mmCIF file of C-alpha atoms in Angstrom:
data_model
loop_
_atom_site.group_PDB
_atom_site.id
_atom_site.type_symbol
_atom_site.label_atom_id
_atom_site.label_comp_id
_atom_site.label_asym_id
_atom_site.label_seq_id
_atom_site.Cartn_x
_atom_site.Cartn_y
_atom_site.Cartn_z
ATOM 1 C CA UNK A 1 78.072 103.143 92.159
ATOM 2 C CA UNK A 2 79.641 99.950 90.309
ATOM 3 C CA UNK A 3 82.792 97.993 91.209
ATOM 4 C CA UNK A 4 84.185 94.644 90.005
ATOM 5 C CA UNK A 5 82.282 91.950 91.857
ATOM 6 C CA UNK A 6 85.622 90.305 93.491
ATOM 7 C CA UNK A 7 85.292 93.444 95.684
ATOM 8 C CA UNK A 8 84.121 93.471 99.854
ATOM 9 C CA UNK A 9 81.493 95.390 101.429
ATOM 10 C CA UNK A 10 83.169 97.269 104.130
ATOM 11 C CA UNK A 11 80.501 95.936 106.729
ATOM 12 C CA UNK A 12 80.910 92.378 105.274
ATOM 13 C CA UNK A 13 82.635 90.480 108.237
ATOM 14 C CA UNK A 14 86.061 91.110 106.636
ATOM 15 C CA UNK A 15 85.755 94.868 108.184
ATOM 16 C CA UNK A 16 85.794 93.149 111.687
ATOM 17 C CA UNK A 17 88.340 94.778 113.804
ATOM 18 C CA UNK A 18 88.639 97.853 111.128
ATOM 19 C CA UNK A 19 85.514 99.840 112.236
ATOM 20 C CA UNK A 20 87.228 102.458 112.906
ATOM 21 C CA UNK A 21 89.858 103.042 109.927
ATOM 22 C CA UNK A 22 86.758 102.554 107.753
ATOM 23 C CA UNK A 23 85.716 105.891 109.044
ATOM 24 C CA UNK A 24 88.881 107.835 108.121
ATOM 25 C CA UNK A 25 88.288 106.986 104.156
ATOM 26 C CA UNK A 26 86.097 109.594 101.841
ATOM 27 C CA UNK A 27 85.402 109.901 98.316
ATOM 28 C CA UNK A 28 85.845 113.065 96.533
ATOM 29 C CA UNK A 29 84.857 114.915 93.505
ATOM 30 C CA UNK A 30 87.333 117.526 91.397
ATOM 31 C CA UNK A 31 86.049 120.444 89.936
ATOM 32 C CA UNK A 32 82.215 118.360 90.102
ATOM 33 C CA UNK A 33 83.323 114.725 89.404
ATOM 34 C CA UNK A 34 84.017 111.494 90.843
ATOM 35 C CA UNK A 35 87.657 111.644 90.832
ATOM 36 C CA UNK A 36 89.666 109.865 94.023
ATOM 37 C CA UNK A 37 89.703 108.298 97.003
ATOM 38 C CA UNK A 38 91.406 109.966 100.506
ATOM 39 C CA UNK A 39 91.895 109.574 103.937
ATOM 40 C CA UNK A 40 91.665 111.835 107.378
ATOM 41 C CA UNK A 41 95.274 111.080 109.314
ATOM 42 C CA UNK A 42 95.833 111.660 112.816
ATOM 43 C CA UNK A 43 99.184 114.229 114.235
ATOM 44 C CA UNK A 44 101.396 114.505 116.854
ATOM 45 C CA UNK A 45 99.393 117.198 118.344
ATOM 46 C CA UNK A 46 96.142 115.033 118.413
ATOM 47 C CA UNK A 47 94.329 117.868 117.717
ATOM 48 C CA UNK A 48 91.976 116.511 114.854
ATOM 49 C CA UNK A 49 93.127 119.391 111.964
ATOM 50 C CA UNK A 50 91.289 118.028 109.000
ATOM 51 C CA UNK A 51 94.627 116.616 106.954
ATOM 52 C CA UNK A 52 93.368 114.202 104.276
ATOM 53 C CA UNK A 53 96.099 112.705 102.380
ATOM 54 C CA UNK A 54 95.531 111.655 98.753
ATOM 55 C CA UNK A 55 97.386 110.968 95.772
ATOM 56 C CA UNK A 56 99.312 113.651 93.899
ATOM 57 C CA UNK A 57 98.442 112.435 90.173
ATOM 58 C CA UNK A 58 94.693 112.731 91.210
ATOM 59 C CA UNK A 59 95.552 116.792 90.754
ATOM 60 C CA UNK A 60 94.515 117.930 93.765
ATOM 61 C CA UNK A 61 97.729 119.865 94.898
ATOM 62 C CA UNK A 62 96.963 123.223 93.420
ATOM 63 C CA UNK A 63 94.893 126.287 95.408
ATOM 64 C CA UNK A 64 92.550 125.833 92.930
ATOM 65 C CA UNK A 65 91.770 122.810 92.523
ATOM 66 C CA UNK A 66 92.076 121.980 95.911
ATOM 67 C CA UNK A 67 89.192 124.499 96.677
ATOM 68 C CA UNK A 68 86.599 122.848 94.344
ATOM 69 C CA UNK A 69 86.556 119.512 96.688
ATOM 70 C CA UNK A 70 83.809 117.841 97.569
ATOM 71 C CA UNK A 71 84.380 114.944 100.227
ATOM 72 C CA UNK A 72 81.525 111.971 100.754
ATOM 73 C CA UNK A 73 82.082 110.344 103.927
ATOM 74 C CA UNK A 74 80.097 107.426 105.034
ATOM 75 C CA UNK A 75 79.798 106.320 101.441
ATOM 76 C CA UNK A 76 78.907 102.408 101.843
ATOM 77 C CA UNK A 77 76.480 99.698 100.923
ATOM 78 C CA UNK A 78 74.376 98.837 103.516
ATOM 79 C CA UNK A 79 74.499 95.210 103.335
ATOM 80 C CA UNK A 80 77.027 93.131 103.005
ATOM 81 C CA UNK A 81 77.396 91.839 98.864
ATOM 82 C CA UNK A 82 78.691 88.321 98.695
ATOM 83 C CA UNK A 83 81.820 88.969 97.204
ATOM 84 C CA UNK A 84 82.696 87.503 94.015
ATOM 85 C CA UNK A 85 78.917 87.230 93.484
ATOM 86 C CA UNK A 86 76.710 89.282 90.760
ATOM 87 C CA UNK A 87 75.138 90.803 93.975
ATOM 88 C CA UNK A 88 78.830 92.718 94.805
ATOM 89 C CA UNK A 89 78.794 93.698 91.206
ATOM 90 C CA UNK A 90 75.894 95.479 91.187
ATOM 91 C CA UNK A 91 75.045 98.745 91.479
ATOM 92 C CA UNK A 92 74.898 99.821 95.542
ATOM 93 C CA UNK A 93 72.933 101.453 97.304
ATOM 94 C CA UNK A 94 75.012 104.308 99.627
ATOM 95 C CA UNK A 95 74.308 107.729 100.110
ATOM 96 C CA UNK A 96 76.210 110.585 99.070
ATOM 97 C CA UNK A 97 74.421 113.228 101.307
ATOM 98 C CA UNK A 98 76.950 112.999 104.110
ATOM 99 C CA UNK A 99 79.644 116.058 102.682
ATOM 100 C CA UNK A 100 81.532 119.161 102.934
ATOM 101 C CA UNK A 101 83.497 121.253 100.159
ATOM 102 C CA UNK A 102 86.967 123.190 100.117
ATOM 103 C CA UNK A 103 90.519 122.600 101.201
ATOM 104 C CA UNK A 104 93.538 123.979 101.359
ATOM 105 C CA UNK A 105 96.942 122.181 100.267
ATOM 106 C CA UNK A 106 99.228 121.732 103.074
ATOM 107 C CA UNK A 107 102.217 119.734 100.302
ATOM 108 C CA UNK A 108 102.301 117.850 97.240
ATOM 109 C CA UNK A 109 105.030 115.551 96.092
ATOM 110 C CA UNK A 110 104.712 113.604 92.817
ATOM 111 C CA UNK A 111 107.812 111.153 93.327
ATOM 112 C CA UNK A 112 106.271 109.459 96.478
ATOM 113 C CA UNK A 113 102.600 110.600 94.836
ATOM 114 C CA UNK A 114 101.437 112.286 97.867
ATOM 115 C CA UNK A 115 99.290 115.396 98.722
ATOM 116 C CA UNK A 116 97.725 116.546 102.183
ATOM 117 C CA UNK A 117 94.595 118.322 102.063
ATOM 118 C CA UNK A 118 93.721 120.177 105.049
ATOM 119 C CA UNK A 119 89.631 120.605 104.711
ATOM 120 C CA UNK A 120 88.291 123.831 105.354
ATOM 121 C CA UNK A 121 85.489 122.623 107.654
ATOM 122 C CA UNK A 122 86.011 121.297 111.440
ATOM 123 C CA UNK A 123 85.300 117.257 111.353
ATOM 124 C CA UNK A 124 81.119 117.311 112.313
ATOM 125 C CA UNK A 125 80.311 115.125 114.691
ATOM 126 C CA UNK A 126 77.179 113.642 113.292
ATOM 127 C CA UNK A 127 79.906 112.098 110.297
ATOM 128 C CA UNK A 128 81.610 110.235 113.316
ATOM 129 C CA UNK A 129 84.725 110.375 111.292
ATOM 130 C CA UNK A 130 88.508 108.942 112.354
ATOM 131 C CA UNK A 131 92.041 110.248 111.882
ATOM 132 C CA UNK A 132 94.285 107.353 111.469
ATOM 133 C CA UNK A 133 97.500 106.349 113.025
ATOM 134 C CA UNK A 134 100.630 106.314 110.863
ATOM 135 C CA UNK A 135 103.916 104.672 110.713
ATOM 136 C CA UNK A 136 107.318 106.230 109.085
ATOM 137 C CA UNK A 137 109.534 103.503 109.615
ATOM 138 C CA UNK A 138 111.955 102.208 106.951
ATOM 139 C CA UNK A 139 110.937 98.499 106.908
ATOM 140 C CA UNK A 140 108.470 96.210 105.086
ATOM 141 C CA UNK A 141 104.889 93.844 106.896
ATOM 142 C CA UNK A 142 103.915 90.815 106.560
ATOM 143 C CA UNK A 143 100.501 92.290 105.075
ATOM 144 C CA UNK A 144 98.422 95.155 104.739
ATOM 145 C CA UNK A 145 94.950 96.555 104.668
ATOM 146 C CA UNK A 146 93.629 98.419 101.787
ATOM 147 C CA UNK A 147 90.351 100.759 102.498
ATOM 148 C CA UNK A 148 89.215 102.625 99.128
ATOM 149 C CA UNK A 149 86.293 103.624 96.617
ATOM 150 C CA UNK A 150 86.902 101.300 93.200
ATOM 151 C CA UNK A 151 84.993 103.367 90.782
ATOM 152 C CA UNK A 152 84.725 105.902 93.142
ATOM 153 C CA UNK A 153 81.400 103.493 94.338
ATOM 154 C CA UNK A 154 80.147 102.332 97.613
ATOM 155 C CA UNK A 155 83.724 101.795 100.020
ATOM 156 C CA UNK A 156 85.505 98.170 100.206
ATOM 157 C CA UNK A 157 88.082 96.814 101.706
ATOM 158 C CA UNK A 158 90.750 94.467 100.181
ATOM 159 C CA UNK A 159 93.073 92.287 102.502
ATOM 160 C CA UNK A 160 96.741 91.367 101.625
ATOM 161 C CA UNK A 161 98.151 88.535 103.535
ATOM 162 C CA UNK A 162 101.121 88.220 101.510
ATOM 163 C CA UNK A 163 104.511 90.327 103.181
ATOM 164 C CA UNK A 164 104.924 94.193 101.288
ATOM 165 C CA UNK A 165 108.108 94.675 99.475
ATOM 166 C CA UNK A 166 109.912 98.156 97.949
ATOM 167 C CA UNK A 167 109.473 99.262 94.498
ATOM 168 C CA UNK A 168 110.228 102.296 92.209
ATOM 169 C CA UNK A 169 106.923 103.240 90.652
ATOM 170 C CA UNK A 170 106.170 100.696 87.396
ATOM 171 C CA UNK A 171 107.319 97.802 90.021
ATOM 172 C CA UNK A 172 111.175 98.166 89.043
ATOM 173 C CA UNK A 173 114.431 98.709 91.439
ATOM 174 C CA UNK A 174 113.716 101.492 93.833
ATOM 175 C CA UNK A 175 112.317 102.167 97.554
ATOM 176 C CA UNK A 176 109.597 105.364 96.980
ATOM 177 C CA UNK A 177 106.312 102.711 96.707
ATOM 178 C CA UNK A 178 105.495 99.338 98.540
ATOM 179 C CA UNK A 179 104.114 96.672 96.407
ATOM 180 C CA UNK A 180 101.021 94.942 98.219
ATOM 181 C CA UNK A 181 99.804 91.616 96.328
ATOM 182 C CA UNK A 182 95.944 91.178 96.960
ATOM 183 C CA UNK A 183 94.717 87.563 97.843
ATOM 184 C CA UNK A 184 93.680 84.977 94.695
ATOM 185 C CA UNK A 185 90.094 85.512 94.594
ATOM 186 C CA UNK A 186 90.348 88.569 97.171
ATOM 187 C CA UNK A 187 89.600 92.128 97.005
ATOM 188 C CA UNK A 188 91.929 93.947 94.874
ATOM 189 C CA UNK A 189 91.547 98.261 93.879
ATOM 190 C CA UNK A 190 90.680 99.796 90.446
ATOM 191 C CA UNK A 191 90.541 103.351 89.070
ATOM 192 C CA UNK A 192 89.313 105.978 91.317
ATOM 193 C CA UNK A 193 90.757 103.881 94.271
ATOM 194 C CA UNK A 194 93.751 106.117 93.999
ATOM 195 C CA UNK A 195 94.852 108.212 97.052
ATOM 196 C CA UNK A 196 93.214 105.215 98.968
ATOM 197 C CA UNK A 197 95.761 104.351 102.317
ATOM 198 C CA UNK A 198 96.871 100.937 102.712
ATOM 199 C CA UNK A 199 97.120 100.592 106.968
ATOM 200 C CA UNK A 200 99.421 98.091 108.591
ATOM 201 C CA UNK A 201 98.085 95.256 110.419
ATOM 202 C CA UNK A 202 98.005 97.331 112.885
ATOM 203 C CA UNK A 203 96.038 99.457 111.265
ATOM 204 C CA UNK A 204 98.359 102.460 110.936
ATOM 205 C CA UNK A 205 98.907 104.246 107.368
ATOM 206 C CA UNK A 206 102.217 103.287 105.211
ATOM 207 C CA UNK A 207 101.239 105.394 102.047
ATOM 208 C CA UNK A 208 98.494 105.808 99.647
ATOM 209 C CA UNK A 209 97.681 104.577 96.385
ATOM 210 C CA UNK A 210 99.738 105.135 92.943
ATOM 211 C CA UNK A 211 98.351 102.057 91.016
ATOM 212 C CA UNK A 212 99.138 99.337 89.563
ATOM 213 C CA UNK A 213 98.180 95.832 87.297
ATOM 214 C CA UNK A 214 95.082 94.490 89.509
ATOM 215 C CA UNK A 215 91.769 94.280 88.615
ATOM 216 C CA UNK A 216 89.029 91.265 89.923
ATOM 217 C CA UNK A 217 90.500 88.914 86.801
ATOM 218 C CA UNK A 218 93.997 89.218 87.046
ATOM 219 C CA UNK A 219 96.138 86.499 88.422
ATOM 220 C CA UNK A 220 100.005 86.206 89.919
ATOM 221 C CA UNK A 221 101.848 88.958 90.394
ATOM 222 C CA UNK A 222 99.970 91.117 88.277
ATOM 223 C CA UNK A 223 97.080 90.874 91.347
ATOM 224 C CA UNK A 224 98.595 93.537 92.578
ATOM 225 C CA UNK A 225 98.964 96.997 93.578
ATOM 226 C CA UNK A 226 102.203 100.144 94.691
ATOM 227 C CA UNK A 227 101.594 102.539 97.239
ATOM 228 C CA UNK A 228 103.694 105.835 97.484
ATOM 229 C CA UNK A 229 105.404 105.306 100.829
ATOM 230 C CA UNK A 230 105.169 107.544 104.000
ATOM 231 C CA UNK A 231 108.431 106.754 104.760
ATOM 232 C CA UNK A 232 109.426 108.586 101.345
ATOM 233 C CA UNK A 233 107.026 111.406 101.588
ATOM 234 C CA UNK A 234 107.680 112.011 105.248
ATOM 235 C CA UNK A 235 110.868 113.996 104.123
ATOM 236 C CA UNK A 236 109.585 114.648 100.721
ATOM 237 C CA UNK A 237 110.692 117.486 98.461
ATOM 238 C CA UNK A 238 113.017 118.841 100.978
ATOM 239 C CA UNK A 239 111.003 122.085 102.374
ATOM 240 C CA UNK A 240 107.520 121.831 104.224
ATOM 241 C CA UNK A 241 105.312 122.417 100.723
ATOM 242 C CA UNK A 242 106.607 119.171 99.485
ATOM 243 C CA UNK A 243 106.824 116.380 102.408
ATOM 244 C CA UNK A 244 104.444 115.325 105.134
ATOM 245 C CA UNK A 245 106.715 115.696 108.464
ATOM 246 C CA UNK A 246 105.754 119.810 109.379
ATOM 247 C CA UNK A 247 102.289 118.652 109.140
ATOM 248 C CA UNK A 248 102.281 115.173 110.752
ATOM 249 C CA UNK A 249 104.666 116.004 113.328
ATOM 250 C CA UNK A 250 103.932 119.796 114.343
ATOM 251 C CA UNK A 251 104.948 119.248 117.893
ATOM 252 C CA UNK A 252 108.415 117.982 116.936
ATOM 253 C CA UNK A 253 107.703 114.596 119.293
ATOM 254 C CA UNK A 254 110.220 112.392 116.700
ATOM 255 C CA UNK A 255 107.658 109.861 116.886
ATOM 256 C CA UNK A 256 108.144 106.770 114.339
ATOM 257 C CA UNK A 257 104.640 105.659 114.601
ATOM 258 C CA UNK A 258 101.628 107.286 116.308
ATOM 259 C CA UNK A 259 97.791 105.814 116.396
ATOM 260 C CA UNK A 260 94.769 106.751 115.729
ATOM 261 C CA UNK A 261 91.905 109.556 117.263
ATOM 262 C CA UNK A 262 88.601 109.139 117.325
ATOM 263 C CA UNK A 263 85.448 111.830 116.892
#
């Protein structure tokens, strides 16, 4: 697929230390098309269920629509595109042959923009996936990593280095999304990124992608991006259909922050 040059090959050295929250991202198709990005999460019951948290305005929250997915894991160039470079603009060359189809929908929230998937089809090993870690906790980082499919193309990952900060969704007063600003000449997301997580330094998820001003040209503040927060969706609606703690927390534990499971 094609992405804005200013984007990073997730095998480009800037994936160092992420090899593993890589594997928890997948692209997806609606009802036969490209739509969104998503990611696999990890529970209190470590048990890998197949939850996949998107966004809610990508339309996924509905029986129906839920059951015509199609997820594309391993979706990736193969070398690493100087970024910023015609080469990272170009189109890649990933394979789409690594997939399954179907879901259920666990909840769907549109204030925080959130909806867990649960796949209908056990993780297989050969896809070598990962469920990520997560962390609930009411409080902002001093920067964040974003793992996604711009374009819904070949996977990237954009770095912030810059601390988070609340938001209302549209970037005024509120606390439901986190506001991540991307580096001058760095990585940033664009359309079909949505749903995407943005991890923690320590590579735990804080919420997914809503949108926002950035593209590989913009500059200031506009370089920049809102994520519907965990911490928001974790209580949700108010009933289990609507937030993520039922799901994410089956076991009751009260855990704040949990990490990651591997295949």
């Amino acid at each position: 697929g094609v992405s804005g040059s200013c984007n990073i090959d997730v095998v480009c050295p800037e994936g160092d230390g992420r090899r593993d929250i890589i594997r928890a991202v997948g692209a997806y198709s609606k009802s036969g098309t490209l739509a969104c990005t998503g990611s696999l999460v990890n529970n209190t019951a470590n048990d890998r269920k197949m939850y996949f948290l998107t966004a809610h305005h990508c339309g996924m929250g509905t029986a129906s629509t839920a059951a015509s997915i199609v997820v594309y894991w391993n979706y990736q160039n193969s070398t690493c595109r100087a970024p910023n470079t015609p080469a990272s603009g170009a189109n890649g060359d990933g394979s789409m042959s690594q997939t399954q189809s179907g879901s259920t929908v666990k909840a769907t929230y549109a204030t925080s923009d959130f909806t867990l998937l649960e796949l209908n089809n056990a993780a297989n090993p050969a896809f070598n996936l990962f469920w990520a870690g997560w962390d609930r906790r009411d409080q902002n980082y001093p920067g964040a990593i974003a793992i996604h499919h711009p374009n819904v193309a070949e996977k990237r990952i954009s770095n912030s280095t810059s601390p988070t900060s609340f938001v209302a969704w549209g970037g005024g007063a509120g606390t439901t999304h986190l506001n991540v600003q991307w580096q001058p000449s760095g990585g940033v997301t664009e359309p079909g990124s949505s749903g995407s997580p943005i991890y923690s330094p320590e590579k735990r998820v804080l919420g997914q992608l809503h949108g926002g001003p950035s593209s590989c040209s913009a500059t200031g503040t506009n370089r920049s991006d809102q994520y519907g927060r965990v911490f928001t969706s974790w209580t949700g609606g108010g009933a289990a259909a609507s937030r993520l703690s039922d799901w994410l927390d089956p076991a009751s534990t009260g855990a704040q922050f949990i990490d990651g499971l591997d295949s």
